[PDB]
Amino acid sequence: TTIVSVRRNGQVVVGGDGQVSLGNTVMKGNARKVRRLYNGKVLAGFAGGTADAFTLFELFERKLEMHQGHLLKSAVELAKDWRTDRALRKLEAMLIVADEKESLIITGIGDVVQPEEDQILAIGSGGNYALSAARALVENTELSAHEIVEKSLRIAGDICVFTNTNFTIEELP
Amino acid sequence: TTIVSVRRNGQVVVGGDGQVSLGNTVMKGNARKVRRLYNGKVLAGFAGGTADAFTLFELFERKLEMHQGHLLKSAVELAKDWRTDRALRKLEAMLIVADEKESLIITGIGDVVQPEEDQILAIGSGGNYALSAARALVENTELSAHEIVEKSLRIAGDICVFTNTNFTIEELP
Amino acid sequence: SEMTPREIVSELDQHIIGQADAKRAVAIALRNRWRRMQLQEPLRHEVTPKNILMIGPTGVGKTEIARRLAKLANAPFIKVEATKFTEVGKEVDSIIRDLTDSAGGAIDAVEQNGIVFIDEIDKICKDVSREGVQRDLLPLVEGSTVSTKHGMVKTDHILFIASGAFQVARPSDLIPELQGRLPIRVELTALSAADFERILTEPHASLTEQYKALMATEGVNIAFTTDAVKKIAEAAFRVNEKTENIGARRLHTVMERLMDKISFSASDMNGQTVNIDAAYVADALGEVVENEDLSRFIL
Amino acid sequence: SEMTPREIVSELDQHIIGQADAKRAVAIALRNRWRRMQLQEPLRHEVTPKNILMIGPTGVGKTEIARRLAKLANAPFIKVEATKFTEVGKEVDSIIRDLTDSAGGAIDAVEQNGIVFIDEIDKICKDVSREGVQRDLLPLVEGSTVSTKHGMVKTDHILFIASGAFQVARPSDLIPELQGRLPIRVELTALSAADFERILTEPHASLTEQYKALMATEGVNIAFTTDAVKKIAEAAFRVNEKTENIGARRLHTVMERLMDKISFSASDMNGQTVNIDAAYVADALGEVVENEDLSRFIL
Amino acid sequence: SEMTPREIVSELDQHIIGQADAKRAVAIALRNRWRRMQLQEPLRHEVTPKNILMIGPTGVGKTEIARRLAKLANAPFIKVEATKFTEVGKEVDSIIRDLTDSAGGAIDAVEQNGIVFIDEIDKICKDVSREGVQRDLLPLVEGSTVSTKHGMVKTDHILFIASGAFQVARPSDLIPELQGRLPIRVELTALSAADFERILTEPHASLTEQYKALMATEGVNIAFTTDAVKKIAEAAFRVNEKTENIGARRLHTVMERLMDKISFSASDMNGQTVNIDAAYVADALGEVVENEDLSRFIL
């Protein structure tokens, strides 16, 4: 899996492949790994284990509904649940979420982390690949945000054997 | 074990071998791995560990009885139980279920997944084999659904040492 | 001195559509109260009720029958959810102390011919608690004396009807002492579109009969058209199937989701008459609500 | 003998800004109490209330409507938090024993036309406890007789309004027996800046109307300027958004955080008049408080 | 008919040193009781108290103010620890039944102008229990009717002051329905050496004022010297800092650890006079006790 997001000129793009890999075989090539939340105003993309990724996503969803969708807050809250005292299941996955305000990735171990400055984020096994690509592009091409993402994923898929070509790019007007 | 299901022209077929393998020996060659649920209107086939497969099946059965048999729903519900907060036993097995409406496989880790488009599903150690077979056939032969399945299983058994020839093919008029 | 098992049925046959076995079951049970009691010195006390176990889904009538038979029997009725006890005696002898309360305090009546309905009994089976109330109820069923602020009342001749869907559990899962005290077991059936239509008009004070009589207060005259009724019904049955099947209470929905408009503005329509036909109905009930996408959980 | 569904709304239309559907919903429900009761021998008892489920956020009025309709209906009102029961009957039949208490003890009134508000019902869903009170409430809703120190009171004709935000849970998560008894479902909307402005002056005894009348006690005369009101409102809406949205109660904050100064020294100002304009408001409400750095948790 | 927000403060200004905001806060709140009530037909009932949230450490006076304002207001006072409820109504409506008890039974007084102090409210935040009492208190705060052996008493106009240190928790952690009902939030400050000195002599019946008046019973005359007072105070502040800061109660320690000797033998000194100067004080208060080695846990 590869999930990368780029943010530039009022545009926020978060897209990823669609391959579900069981061991060294392919479950299904088409899979929506990036989806919409909060009436469709905040973008999400999950990585890791199908099970734990989904259960991570859902938990982030409850928080939003509970905090006027205020992203950043919602995140730190969820993170808190792992830092309390009773170590929760500890989902092995990762989420890249963003909206009109900011971008942010959240591990299922208990932390929220922010982008360098290039507003580039990428999780998954192919992440770093798509990262490099975008981390490049951005620094050398006025390519759109909904464009860099599209090309970066592809660059990855042609490298990560667990990352295919059936993408899904959800942007945020 | 091999459990594959094909769906075409109002026909839904889910059949599988019958071999119970203890370590590298054979417990019993005849075993019904595909069975009927909800008064006999929804098809089921389990894979993995005898114990955990059966306990997965049963849990899917309670849900149906509790949701007017509406398959899809029933599934997502069960899946939910693993995504709540208290990690359930986490059965190591897999189920392929379908009826007049749709096909769907469910892992015991907490997810429900859907078929590509060829409406072909196959779990078990021999799955992918039977898959390939059917994934082929379907694309090149107007063979029935209750026919592709029959041949695909066999192709598998002649390959997977844990998959025998005593099949059981439950179709759905 | 009271109806016959044939006559009683016909009495329920009014207020309730379908469910013959159930209507019949309680029809016998209530005649007996009259048969025994007619009996002599020792046998009047020796014969005990043949309590019932109703098995059917939501809003198909498992309770109406019970509540109606009681009404046509002028008998001390009371309903209790089996689960109420999942967790001066204890909280369970109360089902009698309470019944006697509603009963007024006339024991000569509570004992002789009161009726008890234990809803959701299929729900206290198979967890160390639910399987306790079975035991808690035995005295109640198997014959027990219980103290109440009005005096001593014994459950020797009280009639017990218990319901359940038993979708997951069978009645064979109840504790054996109970399976033995729920001799008679009837099976009410789920309701259909064709059934709704019937409930919609046939009974005494049917939904339509009601809205009609109400609007008649504002000085309005409404008339339901067969074709409309048919649709209202198809409607109910639909959503029950497509979403959460709540039985026949669903009519109380489609009904109110339709009569909204008239119900409001009906005050300012004195003199007029309103005709509820298909084209009307069809336009008060959207079509399907909410994206209802259950996919956001699937891969 | 009482207002019409049009007239009632207008009566709430005063004390409450916005929320038409909700105002309307209860508007019908209260007329019916009058429609039925006008009805004949069997139908007066046969027709039951069409209880409501209000769905909206904090301080948008889901309760005012309920409390106000009751007041314009001179009806036995009572509110209870659904969760009060998360963990002589039990603690829940109390909702009636209590209502009858406040009601005075006149059952002929409690039963005939009392109203019950179950706040936070969206909060006892989906854990083996919360999903018990649903069941605990059924009797209450579905028609039950309950003992109280004043006599027997039945919930057959009590009107039930239940609220909720249902942000996480949908009403479809309630137990089916209940979804069926909360037929009517309205949806109050959150409040806006333009709304606040309105609540700020329009209603009877609006915040401004109050502070104004109070200062008038010390012998002071204050006058709120549109432009000021506009700001007070923009203020409230702001913080609700930026921090914890508490609905409209927020006006009660910005209001008091502004009137602090005058409220204190107002005693020593007899004779004067005070003008609260923008420049004033803008200076009583800092701008933003506390570093509010939520970064100390981020990497 | 009562003091002014200026006059009230001065009344507390006696018994309490420092804490202006707090003294002021309650100063307004108590005038209003008088402002409203002076108001007309509908507005007398419409305006509600603007309850307070005091935030400060131990023994800095968050309670004295409350207790004193009540005394200068001849109003039904009661204190309760928010946590008392961590685990006939329930145990919480009691805060009123109790208040009415102490109040005598005169409801016309309890309701109209009683005051309630909820100590340690910062302590029932963020665990499924503590966050229940918030909800349990809402009725209490948001306006509720409650039964008591003297009659029905409603919390519509009771004044609520709640305290807290909120060192770990902010008031922003309270449930939103409450944050909205603790509009006014003041902040008492910790106490200093220079403060102690002041509490030590200034108030009515100050510690020194007390020991002095007491010894005067045995026929003794003691005189505290500024320089001594200064030391007593430096003393208190010290240990509070160095060990467990208990606020100003600490004066009650250093005070008694000093007056030990005279307090005992004072009976056999009739006629004499005693002068407590530095050299004395300095010699009644050792210097530092116990090795207090907290190293035995370190590596």
Ligand SMILES: Nc1ncnc2c1ncn2[C@@H]1O[C@H](COP(=O)(O)OP(=O)(O)O)[C@@H](O)[C@H]1O
């Ligand atoms: N078969 C039926 N015929 C007429 N009315 C019915 C029928 N089934 C349900 N109802 C109506 O639906 C409502 C629910 O009745 P209820 O007895 O509580 O269903 P259940 O016994 O399954 O819980 C009642 O007001 C009743 O009149």
Ligand SMILES: Nc1ncnc2c1ncn2[C@@H]1O[C@H](COP(=O)(O)OP(=O)(O)O)[C@@H](O)[C@H]1O
């Ligand atoms: N839409 C509104 N119009 C006028 N006043 C409102 C409105 N919404 C809230 N309020 C005021 O805010 C306070 C909170 O009312 P409440 O009914 O408890 O909100 P909710 O039903 O969401 O809990 C009340 O004093 C009420 O007058």
Ligand SMILES: Nc1ncnc2c1ncn2[C@@H]1O[C@H](COP(=O)(O)OP(=O)(O)O)[C@@H](O)[C@H]1O
């Ligand atoms: N600021 C102060 N001025 C005068 N006396 C004080 C002050 N602070 C605390 N005290 C004294 O210390 C004792 C503790 O008072 P208390 O109100 O319970 O502190 P807190 O409200 O923090 O719990 C009281 O007898 C009180 O007179």
Ligand SMILES: [Mg+2]
């Ligand atoms: Mg690849």
Ligand SMILES: [Mg+2]
């Ligand atoms: Mg083989």
Ligand SMILES: [Mg+2]
């Ligand atoms: Mg039922």
Ligand SMILES: [Mg+2]
């Ligand atoms: Mg049920």
Ligand SMILES: [Mg+2]
């Ligand atoms: Mg036995």
Ligand SMILES: [Mg+2]
């Ligand atoms: Mg509320």
Ligand SMILES: [Mg+2]
């Ligand atoms: Mg709330």
Ligand SMILES: [Mg+2]
């Ligand atoms: Mg204290």
